[PDB]
From Swiss-Prot, chain B:
Organism taxonomic ancestry: Bacteria, Pseudomonadati, Pseudomonadota, Gammaproteobacteria, Enterobacterales
Top-rank lineage group of the source organism: Bacteria
Any GO molecular function: structural constituent of ribosome
Family label: Belongs to the universal ribosomal protein uS7 family.
A GO cellular component entry from the record: small ribosomal subunit
Description of how the protein assembles with itself and partners: Part of the 30S ribosomal subunit. Contacts proteins S9 and S11.
Protein name per Swiss-Prot or TrEMBL: Small ribosomal subunit protein uS7
Full-protein residues shown: 3 to 152 of 179
Amino acid sequence: QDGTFDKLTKKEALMRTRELEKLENSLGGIKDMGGLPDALFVIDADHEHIAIKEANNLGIPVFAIVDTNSDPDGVDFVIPGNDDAIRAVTLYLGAVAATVREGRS
Amino acid sequence: RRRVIGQRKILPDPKFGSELLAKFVNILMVDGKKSTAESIVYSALETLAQRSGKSELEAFEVALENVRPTVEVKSRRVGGSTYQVPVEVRPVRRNALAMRWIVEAARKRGDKSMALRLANELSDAAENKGTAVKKREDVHRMAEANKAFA
Amino acid sequence: GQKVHPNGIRLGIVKPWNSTWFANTKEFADNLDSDFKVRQYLTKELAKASVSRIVIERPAKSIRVTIHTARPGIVIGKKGEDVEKLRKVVADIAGVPAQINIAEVRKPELDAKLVADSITSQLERRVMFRRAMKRAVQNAMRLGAKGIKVEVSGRLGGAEIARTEWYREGRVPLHTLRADIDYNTSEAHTTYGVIGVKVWIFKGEI
RNA sequence: UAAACGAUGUCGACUUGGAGGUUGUGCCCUUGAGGCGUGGCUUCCGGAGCUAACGCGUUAAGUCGACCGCCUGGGGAGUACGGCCGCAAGGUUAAAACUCAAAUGAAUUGACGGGGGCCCGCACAAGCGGUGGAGCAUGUGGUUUAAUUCGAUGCAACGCGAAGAACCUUACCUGGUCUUGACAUCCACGGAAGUUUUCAGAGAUGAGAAUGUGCCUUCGGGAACCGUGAGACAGGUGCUGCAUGGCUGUCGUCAGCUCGUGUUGUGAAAUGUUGGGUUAAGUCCCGCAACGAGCGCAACCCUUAUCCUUUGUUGCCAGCGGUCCGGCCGGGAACUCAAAGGAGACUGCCAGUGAUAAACUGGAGGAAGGUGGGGAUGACGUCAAGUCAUCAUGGCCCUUACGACCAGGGCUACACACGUGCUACAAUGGCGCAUACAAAGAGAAGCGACCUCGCGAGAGCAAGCGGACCUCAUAAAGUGCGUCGUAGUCCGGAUUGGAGUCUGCAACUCGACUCCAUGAAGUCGGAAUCGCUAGUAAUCGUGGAUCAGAAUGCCACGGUGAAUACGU
RNA sequence: CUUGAGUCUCGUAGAGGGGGGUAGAAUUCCAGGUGUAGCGGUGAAAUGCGUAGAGAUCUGGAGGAAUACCGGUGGCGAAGG
């Protein structure tokens, strides 16, 4: 925002804005805090076996909702759920949200 | 190769208002001479009417049908081996080669001047001779007879 | 040779000058020659000044040449002698009643000539080419110069091997026009051939 | 006997799955093909587990058990000998001497191919224009010479260095001449010098003579120079880029380089950076164990494609006074032109292809559609590349000298070959006539206005200007006018000698220019070959720098102006 | 003792062997007819075959050897096969 104001150019800075807005579109969730989250609540296993493969290699509790196609040897608190049927995943995440919004008691 | 270029857009004839005639002077340009061609080819084309004795705006093609090409050699060394492989003429060459078939024998014919030497060969095609004519006589030989390798 | 000098190709930006002035044809050439006489006999005689640059401005028949130097106390001479005597030097070696000026160089770590002077000052110190080379690199980094790739000329070691020293550190975007890279080199007449050094300080932008 | 091989001894037990194949069979409406099961044999994936590894992986190379055969570094050697067998060929059993320190296996990153597919580029293709044909100018190779100096002389030299060679230049040869010079710093000596004349010499220099003799001069005698002598001397384009710096060319405006972190692997390492499209790209997006970053491409520069802010003098003259009709003066700076700042094209949008994405396309807007158009910008690297003859530069030299001054010549000499360019070979041209036709530049030691002649060269005269104020400098091809109708030609211009103009003392060698005669080869150039992507080719001229002078070379500007590019 | 191993009842598949015949195409050869100057061969070539009748064609006849198609990552066998 400050660079496009007066620094060197108008149009090139605008190009950088319209491009790196895509960069900020990436990384949308993690963007607030210093990193190293307490735990993890991935919504599948096969699609992101790399995610669990990193969190267990680092020692973070994976709160997965395994499909039945998946490979539950890596997960931490496996949940024999169904990952498709978006209705279902919405229900799961709604319950999790209800829990976490006042887990502070 | 993979990319293509469109045909350059051309304004019509500055004198007859026909783009096809305007393109014609553009091929004969050697030494950058259209103003000389004004006294050479434009002086030639002006005489082409009365010598023909008819309107040279659409009767201008009454000597060009035989000139219509059909094939030319395309050097496809496919896989590293040069072949005959004559591809059928596409519109961006079958008309360009028609103009390429005109002044091959009209520079130093030993006459008054090529201001009107070219004004000798044109009616010859609708008088059944001239340079553009025998061009199609040799094309028929290279194709339509070598089916075992064409 | 494919490495054009980056400063002059960026001279169209705030990149400074060292002889900027005006003339007609009847007196460009002699005035240019007068500028070299002051340009050369103010460097050989001024080895210890650690001069960054001497800049020539010629307003009217009495010029205001300024000198970019490292230590303010050392360039004074014996308290104004070099101010006068070199003005005496220029009063005839340039042919005008000139006026000398002296400019300091704050943080001489920030000048590509002065650092290249510093390494060259210690190249002839009979030291090995690697340890001393990298040691100075971070010194600027602790004091800025957000990027420098450091180069030392050929003839390293007792052998025919005359190689280069690429050794990039930081950001030196040469092809980027908005780079304002600080470049000057230095060379040392060694007991065996020619040993030089090339350094590209990156002084931020604009 | 076999590469008799699944290079896996037989037998048994246990141990996640998937997809096939072939052959039985049980149940199910087999309705049927089959569904649900069950057998056997069988091919291919694959985590556990095992393996050095590849790989095996319920048909194990897994986890165990029972027996049997074999191995113990490579060669010698499956060989000698003995035996047994075989008609014989020969099989089997099976060593040793001696020799070496390895021989091996899996795989990794280079990779060379007379693997392969792909994809890029006037690479090829399709045309154009060419060179090579001639004749002229230069350069390279050779010959001669005193030298015809040196370097480069496969792609990447040969109109190169060397931006302008009569002497000079020029580093070469000869001749004459000086040898602390002719270069420069430091010594001795005295005094300024400078200049004006001589004599000889070609000058070099030598013999000079004088006018001289400025200033500090706690008055040397310096500051200076003059002229000579001893020395530290310098000095030499004198040897080494295959000692160098720097610089330059080379792939190559190449997209490829990588690095950190992360992951995989016992590890060499891989990944990223690959694949699906996409593009100028390591381009974008898609996924991808890669995520970031850096060098690269790209833009950030300049010019150019529109208009606007600010401005009109010389320049434009819209409008006003006449026109001092050219816009001259005023005068507007409307405004051509001009410049201090900007904006405008940015996939921006309609629509679509296309995974929606990216990308791409059709369309629209606006002067400007997908880096608008051009240059500046050459990554890692790359080659003993070249450069010590530009300079600097280690080492090698000699210093009355492989240092030097001066005078002739020679770098252009020829016996030829080549490199480059130009000129033609004409009537797309020539003649002269009328005609309108630009831009960029340069310059008070200059162009030189103008004025006279020279057929011209240029000369005699000369404004002006410090250059939006003066010249070069008019454009040129071009068109209409007659013209020859291809004439070895009014082509072409060599060519020669004559006549002359200027440049510079002086220009045969080795100035230019003009006039005259000169009218040659060559009438479009083979083997062939190369260049060419829009204002392109093609051209037409214009000037500039380099210039005492002496461009077909080179820089810069305009005038006119097409096709080729489907294609890997 | 019955689970290891084997016998019997019963069918299923198979280039599993051994011995017999048998068919047709195909090369070759021989005889016949027609008529003819080349045939073959390779990167070009001669040796070769041939003017007599070769090649080519159809008509037959002899012989020997293997079994196109199905056919398969199929099947069988202790291996060879």
